[PDB]
Amino acid sequence: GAPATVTEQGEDITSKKDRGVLKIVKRVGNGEETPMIGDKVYVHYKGKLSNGKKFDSSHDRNEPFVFSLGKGQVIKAWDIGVATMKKGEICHLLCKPEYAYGSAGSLPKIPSNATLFFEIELLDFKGE
Numbered sequence: 001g002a003p004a005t006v007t008e009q010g011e012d013i014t015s016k017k018d019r020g021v022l023k024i025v026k027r028v029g030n031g032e033e034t035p036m037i038g039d040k041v042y043v044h045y046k047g048k049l050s051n052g053k054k055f056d057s058s059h060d061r062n063e064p065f066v067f068s069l070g071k072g073q074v075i076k077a078w079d080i081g082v083a084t085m086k087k088g089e090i091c092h093l094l095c096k097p098e099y100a101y102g103s104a105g106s107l108p109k110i111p112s113n114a115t116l117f118f119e120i121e122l123l124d125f126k127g128e
């Protein structure tokens with residue numbers, strides 16, 4: 001499925017090139033530039049365990065997820081990934097536990113040492 005496609009075809013977007021965060025652009029965004037650090041970003045996402053089991057989706061509450069980019073308000077893979085996106089883009093990310101919830105996890109739904117799949121749609125962003 002989609003996780004396996006990222007494993008097989010994904011671009012390594014980490015600074016360390018350790019395959020910790022892998023990305024495929026699924027829909028090219030029409031936006032010109034990536035958001036700046038600090039900007040308010042508006043996203044819709046689907047989150048799955050590596051095995052494909054759904055754990056959360058913003059589409060279940062019909063509400064975009066909103067955070068400030070690059071401020072450590074979310075897991076490291078998200079700060080890394082969203083920073084590479086343009087407005088309107090949908091990407092798939094595969095995130096090793098070092099760049100997500102590590103040995104601690106996010107219990108009960110996310111276990112220790114989980115590799116996570118996310119589809120992120122960058123709906124919009126506004127300058128810090």
Ligand SMILES: CC[C@H]1CCCC[C@]1(O)C(=O)C(=O)N1CCCC[C@H]1C(=O)O[C@H](CCc1ccc(OC)c(OC)c1)c1cccc(OCC(=O)O)c1
Binds near residue numbers: 072074078100110
């Ligand atoms: C099973 C995970 C669910 C649980 C219900 C809320 C969303 C959820 O956390 C999720 O789907 C998720 O895994 N997210 C949410 C979308 C952004 C990516 C990821 C996330 O970073 O969530 C943070 C978790 C807290 C966090 C923050 C910073 C971290 O590193 C610096 C970090 O590392 C382990 C962990 C998040 C942020 C804000 C709100 C939130 O949940 C809603 C709430 O608390 O009101 C969850």
